[PDB]
């Protein structure tokens, strides 16, 4: 229903920056906009998430129940 508190694969706390990342990504859409024309590497690095395949995978792909309900 939300971005997991920690990355499922390794347990890095991506939930710390999940709330910031959601709105930062939204504002980054509004300056680029039919799926995903963006690249979020800079936004993710700025939050402090390392170059981990798992954490970036679960951060940018996890659905939010508020967006769909």
């Amino acid at each position: 229903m939300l971005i997991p508190v920690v990355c499922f694969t390794c347990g890095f706390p991506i939930g710390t920056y999940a709330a910031i990342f959601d709105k930062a990504r939204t504002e980054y859409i509004k300056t680029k906009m039919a799926s995903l024309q963006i690249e979020l590497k800079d936004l993710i690095t700025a939050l402090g998430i390392p170059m981990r395949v798992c954490c970036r995978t679960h951060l940018i792909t996890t659905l939010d129940y508020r967006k769909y309900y």
Partner: protein
């Protein structure tokens, strides 16, 4: 020489230079500086220590070290009849269990009392976990930016007993402390793996079957330590890992020194050719201890007939088998000396940890 060489401690920090990150931070959290608890990547250099000991320290720091998590006392989640129908107790409990906490006190108990008296979906953040127990928090134990479930309009959520539970990450992953970020052997040459002919290989020039590396670089990340006290937290984590390993090894040592007295952990048979077979069976023991014992017994007895361990996933135990051309008490004292070698190595590791970080 020294075993644990200089350490590299670099915390993970929010780069506010990015306009979107700063704008979002101040818009929803009113955040302009670094969070009170930040993840720290600790990269370590180990020289003159076997791969088994370094990997055992890594495994302990990963899941075999005791750790704290936030749990809800049974009956804490008020079923009630106004609570949000979507925020189930299981979901919120899973959210709260995995909020990393740097808790120095176990008596802290938090309560979540959030009401949505408005027409919008209200999101419950970790800053809503107010504390009513014992000592007031001089410094927060968790970041206030964690997203706990959202509340539909007119709905609430009341959880009144959120306490701190102690456990190891092997049993429940919510206690996992250190996440792996690097592991390499510095004394083994590496191929250029970007080449086509070496792309299917690991990269190391020596085959793993015939390689005995003694120089390792280990990288671990701790998910939340206080920002002003990073070094002391890293010191405590590493020292506690060493203490845990030493304590378990001493638990094995007691079984060893009770060898004449009957015990079902250890049995001894003198089979045919003066060889004595020692089978050490310990329940709820991991590959860390078995690998340490095998490696150090093999180092102390190079001419051994057979040393091996197996932690079968079922039967949930470590079974270590030693066969040697020696009498029962000679074998026992060799194994005792090998355990003393393990204790010496990890005590030296703790000494180096104290020397280095400070």
């Amino acid at each position: 020489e020294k075993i644990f060489q200089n350490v590299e401690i670099k915390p993970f920090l929010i780069d506010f230079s990015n306009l979107f990150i700063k704008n979002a931070a101040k818009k929803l959290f009113q955040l302009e500086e670094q969070l009170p608890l930040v993840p720290v990547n600790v990269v370590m250099d180990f020289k003159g220590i076997s791969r088994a000991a370094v990997h055992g320290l890594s495994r302990v720091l990963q899941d075999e070290i005791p750790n704290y998590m936030l749990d809800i006392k049974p009956g804490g989640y008020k079923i009630e009849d106004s609570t949000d129908l979507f925020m189930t107790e299981q979901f919120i409990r899973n959210r709260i269990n995995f909020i990393p906490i740097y808790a120095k006190n176990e008596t802290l108990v938090f309560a979540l009392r959030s009401l949505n008296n408005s027409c919008e979906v209200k999101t419950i953040y970790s800053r809503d976990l107010i504390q009513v127990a014992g000592p007031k928090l001089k410094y927060p134990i968790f970041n206030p930016t964690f997203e706990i479930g959202f509340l539909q309009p007119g709905k609430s959520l009341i959880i009144e007993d959120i306490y701190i539970k102690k456990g190891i990450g092997r049993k429940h992953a919510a206690f996992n402390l250190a996440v792996k970020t690097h592991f390499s052997h510095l004394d083994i040459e590496q191929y250029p793996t970007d080449k086509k002919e070496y792309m299917a290989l690991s990269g190391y020039k020596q085959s793993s079957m015939t390689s005995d590396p003694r120089h390792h670089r280990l990288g671990l990340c701790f998910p939340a330590v206080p920002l002003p006290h990073i070094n002391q937290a890293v010191r405590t984590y590493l020292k506690n890992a060493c203490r845990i390993i030493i304590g378990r090894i001493q638990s094995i040592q007691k079984i060893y020194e009770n060898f004449e007295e009957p015990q079902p952990e250890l049995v001894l048979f003198s089979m045919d050719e003066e060889k004595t077979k020692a089978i050490i069976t310990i329940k709820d023991e991991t590959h860390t201890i078995g690998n340490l014992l095998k490696t150090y017994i093999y180092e102390m007895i190079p001419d051994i007939s057979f040393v091996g361990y197996q932690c079968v996933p079922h039967k949930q135990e470590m079974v270590l088998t030693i066969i040697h051309k020696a009498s029962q008490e000679d074998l026992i004292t060799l194994l005792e000396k090998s355990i003393q070698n393990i204790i010496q190595t990890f005590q030296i590791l703790e000494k180096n940890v104290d020397e280095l970080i400070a």
